[PDB]
């Protein structure tokens, strides 16, 4: 545990409010402890699956 | 004579418990009417 789970409870896939899935997956990738350069490398990726 | 239910992303496979949580309260009026 690092941050509160309540944000995870706020944006659930069953509530039908998740109108921007890529932002939810980025908000979930933010919890990663990987270095900012690794985040920039993920930003270098253009394809969504990649 | 009830309107077709709002599934709103809640599959219910046969013989399988499932939960539904619509945000509107009008169906709650129907739930109180059926008691």
- Cα B13 to chain centroid distance, Å, stands at 14
The 3-class SS string of chain A reads CCCCCHHHHHCCHHHCCCCCHHHHHHHHHCCCCCCHHHHHHHHHCCCCCC
List the Cα angle B5/B18/A27 in 5-degree steps: 95
By the 8 A CB rule, do A28 and A11 touch? Answer: no
H/E stretch holding B30? helix B26-33
B9: contact with A, CB 8 A cutoff: yes
Distance (Å, rounded) from C-alpha B23 to C-alpha B9? 13
Take residue A49 and report the two structure tokens written for it.
């699956």
Q: Which residues of B touch A14 (CB under 8 A)?
A: 9-10, 21
Q: What is the resolution in angstroms?
A: 4.4
Alpha-carbon dihedral angle through residues A35, A37, A41, A44, given to the nearest 10 degrees? 140
A16: contact with B, CB 8 A cutoff: yes
- Using what technique was this structure determined? cryo-EM
Direct distance between the N- and C-terminal alpha carbons of chain B, in angstroms, rounded to an integer: 16
Q: Which residues of A touch B21 (CB under 8 A)?
A: 14
Q: Which residues of A touch B10 (CB under 8 A)?
A: 14
Helix (H, G, I), strand (E, B) or coil at B33: helix
Question: Hey, how many other C-beta atoms are within 10 angstroms of the C-beta on A32?
Answer: 11
How far off is chain B from A25, nearest CA to CA, in Å?
A: 19
């Amino acid at each position: 545990p690092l941050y509160r789970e309540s944000v995870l409870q706020m944006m659930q896939a069953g509530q039908r409010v998740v109108d921007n899935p890529i932002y939810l997956s980025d908000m979930g990738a933010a919890l990663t402890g990987a270095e900012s350069h690794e985040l920039q490398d993920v930003l270098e990726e253009t394809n969504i699956p990649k | 004579h009830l309107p077709l239910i709002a599934i709103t992303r809640n599959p219910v496979f046969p013989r399988f418990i499932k939960i539904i949580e619509v945000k509107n309260k009008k169906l709650v009026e129907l739930l109180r009417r059926k008691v």
